Structure 1
Amino acid sequence: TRPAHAVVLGASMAGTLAAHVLARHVDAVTVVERDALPEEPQHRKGVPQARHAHLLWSNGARLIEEMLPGTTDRLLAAGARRLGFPEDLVTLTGQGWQHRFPATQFALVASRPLLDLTVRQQALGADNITVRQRTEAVELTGSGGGSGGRVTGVVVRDLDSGRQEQLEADLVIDATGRGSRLKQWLAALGVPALEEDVVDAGVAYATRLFKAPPGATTHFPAVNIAADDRVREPGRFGVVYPIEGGRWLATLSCTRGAQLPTHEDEFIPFAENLNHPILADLLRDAEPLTPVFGSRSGANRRLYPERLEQWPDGLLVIGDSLTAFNPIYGHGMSSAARCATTIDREFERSVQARAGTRALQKAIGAAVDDPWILAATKDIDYVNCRVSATDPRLIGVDTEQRLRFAEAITAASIRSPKASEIVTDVMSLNAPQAELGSNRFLMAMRADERLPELTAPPFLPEELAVVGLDAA
């Protein structure tokens, strides 16, 4: 019969959205969150990635807006900014500067804790959602492997008390992020291991918060230095996004074989050694507000529970636990919104053999293919890249043809409007990566006008005035 009680494990983006949606179809929804959840925008041990820059692409923004009307207006009231792509950015690519064509896509930019709090507020207010903060999921109960295994509940442990308790449920949602022990829990229940694709370029991040020159959060574009020669050299990148409170979030990145700034005095010299020193120039005399924060969670890994015949009934895995991506492309939250979107849209059809949770998990798997195959294609050809994947779209490919086509796509997007719009659709997770091989894109790539090469970064004079620069 219908599920009556659902336990969502984890209360970050994936868990929160899935819990809000399940509450519409399930009588009772418990959320099990290890951390205490602040009622003020504040960092916390469970989401350490929140220290680094976070783009909410249009896909995620529009999907969240549909689940939770008013969330965008609430975020912008709080000082968030809607960056239009490519209009509101100064971007250096491997092929040159991006012409700031009129915005055809957008991302919402803000400190991640502000976005998390604003979503929790809109989503977890429901009467039939009980969130148990300071509570840790320890393992899953039930049988597994063979014939017809199912998950019956979850053993949770109060952290402030230390007591343990078995929490029974008809449905269990693992949303415990990239560091999920699902594999451990599954081995405990006697479930055979899952298929796992991995494309790991060894990306790491180093981030500092800065106080921005007055007005730069609204009248100065974001600046991104994303040039790369993947097969010869490890990548080195840098970004400066505006966030709320007149602040600049500056995030530097590299791939395996390169070295990030460990100390504060090494931050600027890394931005100086990029293909253009604009970032070092912008941050030279900005006031630093934090030390350097680091992250090493940059690998593209994807589990395939939809392929496991022994997948236990009543168990779903969403978010970073199901599949996590190279954050340079900023799709983690959008694909979290996708998983909750999919649960909302296939739940009723799936509960009418409990082939309904394996149907849910199958629809969920399809929903996250777009960010997986985008990040895996871009990263697969880096020098030193660790690759362990069965995806035929990656393994049996003529690599030099792949990079020649990669350079063509970038060369078209930076200097031709029709080719730029399609790329932003893919970059904003609103169109599949395969659209860039479509005849439509091939004809835009060939027939559209190509503006001249920008010799200097395309800043408006006003914009250089806001930060006290001119010339290049």
Structure 2
Amino acid sequence: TRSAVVLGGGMAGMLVSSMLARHVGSVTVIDRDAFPAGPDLRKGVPQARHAHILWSGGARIVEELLPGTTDRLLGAGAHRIGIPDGQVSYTAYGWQHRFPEAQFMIACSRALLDWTVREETLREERIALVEKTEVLALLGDAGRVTGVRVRDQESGEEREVPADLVVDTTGRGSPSKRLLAELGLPAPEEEFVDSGMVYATRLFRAPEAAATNFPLVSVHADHRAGRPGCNAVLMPIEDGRWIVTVSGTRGGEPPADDEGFARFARDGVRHPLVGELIAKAQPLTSVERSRSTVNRRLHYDRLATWPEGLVVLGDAVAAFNPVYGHGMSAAAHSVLALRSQLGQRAFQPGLARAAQRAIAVAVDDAWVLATSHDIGYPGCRTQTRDPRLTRHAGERQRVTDLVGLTATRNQVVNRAAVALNTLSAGMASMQDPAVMAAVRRGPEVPAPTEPPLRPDEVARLVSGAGVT
């Protein structure tokens, strides 16, 4: 009984459809893109060409919604990299000491990830993906949404698709503002923080012995220094490749040519490690850039009136600067928020509004971590009324620089710090007296003077071929 319509067949649409199918009779997923039968790139998800990190916090939610997905990923070549034992990271406060594992992440191409999530989701015969279909309008009115009017791209025919619950997961380019304007709802408050960052990514084939068990490598900007923020990240993926992404805020954007890529990875960042590693490797693709960098949030939950049977989640409600890598886990967290409201209120009046409010709390931590670090860079453009970004930005940056400094050299602080950064624990968890005590205890190890690479990792950057 009861039917749901999901707008957009990306990561959020699939996760929300897996969940919704356990509460409703039928799920229909509408997407305007065409979907490949294998793990390939598609135009509906252009971000798939850049490095994608799946933090533990989101990974554990994906596992719960789609049991077995983690292993199908690992079974297909994805790497499980422990944090911080498997990262070589030059943070704004110096090198992170590689303490034993506290959290983890899954390292794979986004194309493989999306395909593995879709395939596992669509095993449920009651979910149906409707490809190459444009979303024209929401059916019903400002009081209650009753489905969506769509158009088939091939035939051009328009038809209405009924629904007791419509979920918009059309991503960052969501037409939800248009859709609800045609419904007759007021425009929602839009908050954004635009550092003006730009991405540049190339694929590489790793040295043969380094195809497995290689660490995640990152060089971070110093947000405290009044200079454009430049970063560089090297991540293993399936089939013995490395995806390498370099980024830079307004005034420090990486170039588009292959030659300038290696120099930026060498000279454009605060340490040339990533530039040194990619020179052990062979390029496979040319430079791909992207400007989809703005942290933008739509406060749908604060509207004066909200229709029953309508929910917005994923990038359509809150998108982030990708250098922190929270987007997918934020979408996962908001699917569990919808699920929790479904079990509490079923489909009674108030479900859509209660879900929209709960989704706003679900994404808040990822929204704060990104905006409070982007707001400092020179030339940053902002539109916000949030006091945490306007009034208490200086004091919140003072506590955060001391947790970050100590976490590089204190095991307890790091543990609690990476639990928050991977969205495996809430913001309040940093207020545990046991955490602030360790912060006051100070460093237990010296600050590393060189990149903390293992000899056996560096050893596998060469083959030894020309040696009798």
Quickly name the TM-score band, shorter chain normalised.
over 0.9
- Map 1:417-428 to 2 at 5 A: 417-428=411-422
1:292 aligns with 2:290: no
Deviation at 1:162, TM superposition (A): 2.0
| SS across alignment from 1:39 | coil
Instruction: Report 1:10-409 matches (<5 A).
Output: 10-144=8-142, 149-273=143-267, 274-351=269-346, 354-397=349-392, 399=394, 401-409=395-403
For the pair 1:456 / 2:445, whether they are aligned, the reply is no
| Residues 374-414 of structure 1: CA deviation (Å, up to 9, x unaligned) | 21222221211112112222221152x34333321221011
User: CA-to-partner distance for each residue in 1:272-312, whole Å, 9 max, x for gaps?
Assistant: 11222111111124211111111111111111111112111
The answer to whether the 8 A contact 1:242-1:248 is kept is: yes
| Letter paired with 1:188 | E
Q: In the aligned structure 1, how far is the partner of 2:238 from the partner of 2:347?
A: 46
SS in 1 for 2:81: strand
The alpha carbon displacement at 1:437 in A equals 4.9
**In structure 2, do the counterparts of structure 1 residues 130 and 272 end up closer, same or farther at CA, with 3 Å as the change threshold?**
same
Q: Is the 1:136–1:159 Cα contact (8 Å) retained in structure 2?
A: yes
Matching residue's letter, 2:380: C
Q: Distance in 2 between matches of 1:198 and 1:312?
A: 25
Structure 1 range deviating more: 55-64 or 354-363: 354-363
Ranges of 4+ aligned residues in structure 1 off by more than 4 Å: none
Q: What CA distance in whole angstroms lies between the structure 1 residues aligned with 2:353 and 2:37?
A: 36
Cα shift readout 1:84-109 (whole Å, capped 9, x = no counterpart): 11110110012111100001000011
Measure the CA separation in 1 of the matches of 2:131 and 2:263: 42
Partners in 2 of 1:386 and 1:437 — Cα distance? 31
User: How far did residue 217 of structure 1 move?
Assistant: 3.1
Inter-partner Cα distance in structure 2 for 1:287 and 1:449: 39
Confirm whether residue 443 of structure 1 aligns to residue 437 of structure 2. yes
In structure 2, how many angstroms separate the alpha carbons of the residues matched to 1:458 and 1:370? Answer: 30
- One-letter identity of the residue aligned with 1:122: E
Q: Distance in 1 between matches of 2:225 and 2:448?
A: 25
SS in 2 for 1:218: coil
Q: Tell me the secondary structure at the aligned position of residue 415 of structure 1.
A: coil
**SS of residue paired to 2:24:** coil
SS of equivalent to 2:100: coil
Equivalent position amino acid for 1:204 in 2: V
User: Which residue pairs with 2:427 in the alignment?
Assistant: 433
Distance 1:174 1:258 in 2: 35
Distance across 1 between alignment mates of 2:173 and 2:333 = 20
1:415 corresponds, among 399, 406, 409, to: 409
CA distance in 2, matches of 1:29, 1:436: 39
Unaligned ranges ≥5, structure 2: 464-468
Q: Deviations over 1:147-196 (max 9, x none)?
A: xx222221211112222222222111100000001001111111101122
Quote the offset at 1:230 in angstroms: 4.2
- The answer as to whether partners of 1:205 and 1:260 remain within 8 angstroms in 2 is yes
Q: For the structure 1 residues 57 and 353, does the alpha-carbon distance in structure 2 shift closer, same or farther, using more than 3 Å as the test? A: closer
Q: How many angstroms apart in 1 are the aligned matches of 2:393 and 2:305?
A: 35
Task: Name whichever of 340-349 and 317-326 sits farther off.
Answer: 340-349
Give the corresponding residue for 2:466: none
Deviation at residue 7 of structure 1 after TM alignment: 0.6
For 2:128 and 2:223, the matched residues in 1 are separated by 50
Q: CA RMSD in A?
A: 1.6
Cα distance in structure 1, aligned partners of 2:27 and 2:447:
55
Residues 21 and 343, structure 1, Cα contact 8 Å, conserved in 2: no
Q: Which moved more, 1:305-314 or 1:460-469?
A: 460-469
**CA gap 1:318/1:398 in 2 versus in 1, 3 angstroms:** closer
Cα contact 1:27–1:128 (8 A) shared by 2: yes
- Following the alignment from structure 1 to structure 2, what is the Cα–Cα distance between the partners of residues 352 and 189? 21
Amino acid at match of 2:46: P
**Structure 2 letter corresponding to 1:34:** R
Please report the TM-score for the alignment, with normalisation by the length of structure 1: 0.94
The 2-side partners of 1:276 and 1:183 are apart by 42
- Aligned pairs, number: 462
Change (3 A) 1:398 1:207: closer
In the aligned structure 1, how far is the partner of 2:224 from the partner of 2:140? 47
Contact 1:71-1:122 at 8 Å conserved across structures: yes
Aligned counterparts of 1:161 and 1:241: Cα–Cα separation in 2 = 43
Q: Quote the Cα distance in structure 2 between the aligned partners of 1:6 and 1:48.
A: 27
Structure 1: gaps spanning 5 or more residues: none
Following TM superposition, by how much is the alpha carbon of 1:348 offset from its aligned partner in structure 2, in angstroms? 3.0
- What is the CA deviation profile of residues 435-459 of structure 1, one whole-angstrom value per residue up to 9, with x for unaligned ones? 4355332211112543112111011
Call closer, same or farther: CA 1:155–1:415 in 2, change over 3 Å.
same
Secondary structure at the aligned position of 1:294 is classed as strand
How high is the sequence identity, in percent, across the aligned residues? 48
SS of the counterpart of 1:394? helix
TM-score normalised by the chain length of structure 2:
0.95
